[PDB]
Amino acid sequence: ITVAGVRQNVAELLDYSNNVKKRNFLETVELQIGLKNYDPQRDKRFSGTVKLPTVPRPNMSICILGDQHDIDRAKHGGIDAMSADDLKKLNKNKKLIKKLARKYDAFIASESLIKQIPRLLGPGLSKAGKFPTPVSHSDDLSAKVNEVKSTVKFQLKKVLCMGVAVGNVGMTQEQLVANIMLAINYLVSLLKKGWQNVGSLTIKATMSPPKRLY
RNA sequence: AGACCCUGUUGAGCUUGACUCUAGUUUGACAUUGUGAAAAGACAUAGGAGGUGUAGAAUAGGUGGGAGCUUCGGCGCCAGUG
């Protein structure tokens, strides 16, 4: 992995996304990685979160669950909010939980409603992979939502493939290369063998062709 | 101070499935020990093709970006099913 090669791949992906096959929407940029010489079903599953130098997923949507103070804090940043009464109105509906998980890409829950989310909303969010992150009342809800949007997760799944957003097509090439380098460094730090445990790596846009870097 | 008898922590020669060894002999393995093909096996890659226990738009590898794809037929989102 080289910074110049990553910048060249990002420039090629941006040129393909902008000049040849420009889409009808702001296509985001992602990077896909593979694991090797490890057992995703028998060894310990690593996990972690790292905030990139740029916004990884600017098109991601976040839903806030909390009290009236949390709703006011979410409305201060313009994010949608869900009250405790709105959570209890679901009454453990799996279909409603799946619809909420399809509508909202990520969830942030306050400390008061974090324990009551599994009792009211049920395990639908955990089944869909959208478990809400905890949040305190003294922290800034808008800043927490922005940090959650700009950060990515590297938890090991049941398969050897993984991926993470590194920005968008409208972002700068240098910023995209820096985000990709930060994600690669986080993956190398999480891996026990470093680059020996990485199978391959590619970078692309949402609709542009991929470019292999490893 | 012979011969004979008796005794020995007795000495020595000889014999034998007495004990422990051993020459010789026999057998296996490593090294000396290389070169081709042939038949099986294991990996490596250069390609190619597949994913129904089942509800459900489809015969659901899974995963990340994703609301648009675009080869203009419809596929999508959504509904619905998990």
- 3-class DSSP state for residue A97? helix
Q: What torsion do the CA atoms of A176, A147, A46, A168 make, to the nearest 10 degrees?
A: -20
Other beta carbons within 10 Å of A53: 16
What does the block give as tokens for A65?
A: 């669950």
Q: What's the CA gap between A178 and A180, in Å, rounded?
A: 5
Experimental method: cryo-EM
Query: Which single residue is written with the structure tokens 């909390």?
Result: A66
Do residues A13 and A146 touch, judged by C-beta distance below 8 A?
A: no
What does the block give as tokens for A47?
A: 């996990």
Q: What's the CA gap between A185 and A160, in Å, rounded?
A: 18
Do residues A33 and A204 touch, judged by C-beta distance below 8 A?
A: no
Cα-based angle A161, A211, A26 (whole degrees, multiple of 5): 90
Resolution of the experimental model, in Å, one decimal: 2.9
Q: What's the CA gap between A111 and A186, in Å, rounded?
A: 28
Query: Which single residue is written with the structure tokens 């296509």?
Result: A27
| Closest nt to residue A164, judged CA to C1' | B64
The amino acid that residue A184 corresponds to is I
Other beta carbons within 10 Å of A115: 10
| Closest nt to residue A161, judged CA to C1' | B63
Specify the length of chain A in residues: 214
Kindly report the bases of strand B lying within 7 A of a protein C-beta atom: 61-70, 77-82
Do residues A179 and A54 touch, judged by C-beta distance below 8 A?
A: yes
Q: Which helix (H) or strand (E) holds A204?
A: strand A198-205
Q: What's the CA gap between A71 and A64, in Å, rounded?
A: 7
Do residues A3 and A145 touch, judged by C-beta distance below 8 A?
A: no
Q: What's the CA gap between A60 and A81, in Å, rounded?
A: 15
Tell me how far the alpha carbon of residue A62 is from its chain's centroid: 11
